[PDB]
Amino acid sequence: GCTPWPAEFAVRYREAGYWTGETFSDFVTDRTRRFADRLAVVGAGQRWTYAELGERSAVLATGLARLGIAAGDRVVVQLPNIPELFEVVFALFRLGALPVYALPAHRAHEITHLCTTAQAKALIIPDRHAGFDYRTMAAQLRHAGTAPEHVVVVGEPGGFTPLAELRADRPDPGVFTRPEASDAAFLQLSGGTTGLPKLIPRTHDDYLYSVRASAEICALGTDTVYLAALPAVHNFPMSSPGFLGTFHAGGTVVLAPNPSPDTAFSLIETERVTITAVVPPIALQWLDAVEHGSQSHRDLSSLRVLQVGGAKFAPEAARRVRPVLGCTLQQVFGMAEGLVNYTRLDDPDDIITTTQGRPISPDDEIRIVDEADRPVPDGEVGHLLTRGPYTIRGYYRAEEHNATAFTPDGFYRTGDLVRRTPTGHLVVEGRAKDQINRGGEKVSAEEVENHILAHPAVHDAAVVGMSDPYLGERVCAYVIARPPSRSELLRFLRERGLASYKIPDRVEFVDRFPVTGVGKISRSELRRELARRLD
């Protein structure tokens, strides 16, 4: 159910050296041999060399093959920032199996969607993380008939398969498989705009291209110490340049269990982190913690680059990074569907602090168009369309949606409103898609509304973003009840299985939506008007 690049583009990208033919199977073997003696992973009291990560992943791949996982099978991986993540992912790559990445904040709704859509053979989870019991979630899917036939638990397994059972056998390279580099290597989740998130297939050639190129843009090497402050399987901390870029270059990946200033600064001090990636709300927390005293003592001198991305970062705050934290800001405007934009580490500070960067590739095609797909004069704001060597041509098994998300000639409709500077840098100025961006976590208004409408006491509902100085937007729900408690409504939404960050920050019960002409405007227009009230 994947959509391939046209043959002429594929030829172009291989001839240009973007698509090298290397697979993630090749990657695991080559990087763990090339950097064997170096420190690869620091986390949860563990310190693994590249050699140890190689041996551990070979053992785990043998165990997954014994379990029944074969080349081409999909395996949903929903693990927190713990070292087991890497050994699990590498092991799946050794087998030619496809990780399907879920984030720790995802819940029964999203996980059911991923398992059923990807027809996943296994689900890999922790026992508990941040108060949530993933074993109970997996048992809920089993009870409903939607769970993978194999559930593997890191920690205390309950009645599921403990991860340790997959380490029982010595390595057997006979069970490994090398796929084709043009095959999908894994699936990940899109931010989401309609009722359900779409799955994104990424191939070995295109993803590894974006990783190698990002590693070069971000000056990674064996001296790199990358702090994974964000959930490590998200596109940003995974490939931009993320932990994959760090492994490609031979550096050390340090796992932060949470992004709080105390935890993160302690790791930066101890492990001498050189680069990390955060969303703007976390950046603001770190800046305030240092500038206004609480963490002024911390030694952050090893930090060379602070990446901030996923949501808009105001120039006012961007200007504080070098003076407060002593490092270079890098803005990163990317998307799970492909295109990633970086400010360059040698750009002047006005470009660094006022733009969201320029694309990775010379073959990243950028069209900024009006409502009739006509290009706008250079410098004006318009809809961003993009096409390139690591941007998909379609979502997984989503042909109806693909008809609308891509133009006939293969440009992806990002849903972003941007303008272009004379140097090619982009400035993110708005959005056109139905999608509240809560400090980097994306919430579809239509999805939350659909779940709210499922409540018996509710007659209508409209979900809109409310401007927020830290998060950009919080989630506000207007609800017309034929009303239930606010606490009770949020409880029902948690019982529905909605991701943690999709639960509304604010609920306002109303006899009618406080806008003029409710029966005469579309739902999208309604949300725009309501949100205008809240700014």
Ligand X SMILES: Nc1ncnc2c1ncn2[C@@H]1O[C@H](COP(=O)(O)OC(=O)c2cccc(O)c2O)[C@@H](O)[C@H]1O
Per the annotation, where are the binding residues for AMP?
Answer: 234, 310, 332, 334, 336, 416, 433, 442
> Pattern of binders to ligand X over 418-437, x per CB under 6 A?
----------x--x-----x
Task: Indicate which single residue of 331, 361, 386, 444 sits in contact with ligand X (rule: CB under 6 A).
Answer: 331
- 498 counts as binding ligand X under rule CB under 6 A: no
Which two three-digit tokens encode residue 347? 């750009």
Q: Does 334 bind ligand X (CB under 6 A)?
A: yes
What does the per-residue mask of binding to ligand X show for 237-276, with x meaning CB under 6 A?
--xx------------------------------------
Q: Show the site string, 54-93: x = touches ligand X by CB under 6 A, - = not.
A: ----------------------------------------
| Burial profile 160-197: b = 16 or more Cβ within 10 angstroms, e = fewer | bbebeebeeeebeeebbeebebbbbbbbbbbbbbbebb
Q: Report the SS3 class of residue 23.
A: coil
Quote the CA–CA distance of 37 and 140 in Å, as a whole number.
Answer: 43
Binding status of residue 416 toward ligand X by CB under 6 A: yes
Judged by CB under 6 A, the chain residues 434 through 463 that form the site for ligand X are 437, 442
Q: Site map for ligand X, 92-121, x if CB under 6 A?
A: ------------------------------
Mode of pairing for the β-strands spanning 39-43 and 441-443: unpaired
Nearest distance from residue 235's CB to ligand X, in Å?
A: 3
Residue 416, SS3 per DSSP: strand
Q: Residue 21: left if φ>0, alpha if ψ -120 to 50, beta else—which one?
A: left
Interhelix angle 204-217/24-34, nearest 10 degrees: 40
- The residue count for binding ligand X (CB under 6 A) is 23
Q: Judged by CB under 6 A, which of 32, 62, 330, 414 binds ligand X?
A: 414
The H-or-E segment that residue 431 falls in is strand 426-431
Spell out a b/e string for 260-270, using b for 16 or more CB atoms within 10 Å of the CB, else e.
ebeebbebbbe
Give the chain's length: 535
Per-residue binder mask for ligand X (CB under 6 A), 202-241, x = binder: ---------------------------------xx--xx-
Q: Which of the ranges 102-110, 283-291, 333-341, 527-535 carries the binding residues for ligand X, by CB under 6 A? A: 333-341
Among 274, 356, 391, 444, binds ligand X (CB under 6 A): 356
CA 386 to chain centre: 19
273 within 8 A of 296, measured Cβ to Cβ: no
Extract the annotated binding site.
234, 310, 332, 334, 336, 416, 433, 442
Give residues in contact with ligand X (CB under 6 A): 191, 235-236, 239-240, 309-312, 331-336, 340, 356, 414, 416, 428, 431, 437, 442
